[PDB]
Amino acid sequence: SGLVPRGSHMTVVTTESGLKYEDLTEGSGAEARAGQTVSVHYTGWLTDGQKFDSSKDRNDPFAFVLGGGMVIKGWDEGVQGMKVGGVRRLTIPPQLGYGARGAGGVIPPNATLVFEVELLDV
Ligand SMILES: [Cl-]
């Protein structure tokens, strides 16, 4: 608990795993639930602002089985509860990301990852 961890507008949520998220836009559509194949647009940045991945730049949304272990842990946790049309900012500590290994030649070891995710379909 505590006040300061809830952010400048009292809108930052911290979960038991240490994931943080903030709903930038609350969707009006159906809720994302574990087991659904959801489709999203996203961008990811390192904490220095460097973009490392974006579906928008490929002009192709990304579909995955939510909760299915097919993405980093912070995504499987953080996309749940979004509603279609929503935009959520995920701040993913490295144990819920790529850990000590990093990834792809573009995410260093022990990196916190920032994503903005738009939920398109469930
Ligand atoms: Cl933070």
Going from the Cα of 64 to the center of ligand 1, the distance in angstroms, rounded, reads: 26
Technique of determination: X-ray
At 11, list the tokens: 């809108």
Residue 13 β-bridge partners: 21
Residues 6+ apart with CB under 8 A from 7: 22
| CA 8 distance to own-chain centroid | 20
How far is 79 from 96, CA to CA, in rounded Å? 13
The CATH number of whichever domain residue 109 belongs to comes to 3.10.50.40
Range of the domain at 85: 1-122
CA-to-CA dists, residue 1 to 46, 79, 113, angstroms: 26, 22, 23
Numbered residues of the known binding site for Mg(2+): 60-61
25 in Cβ contact with 83 (< 8 Å): no
Going from the Cα of 116 to the center of ligand 1, the distance in angstroms, rounded, reads: 14
**Overall domain count for the chain:** 1
How far is 91 from 22, CA to CA, in rounded Å? 9
Going from the Cα of 105 to the center of ligand 1, the distance in angstroms, rounded, reads: 24
Numbered residues of the known binding site: 60-61
Positions marked active-site:
42, 52-53, 72, 98, 115
- Resolution (Å) of this entry: 0.9
Dihedral, 79, 55, 92, 80 alpha carbons, nearest 10: 0
At 4, list the tokens: 């300061």
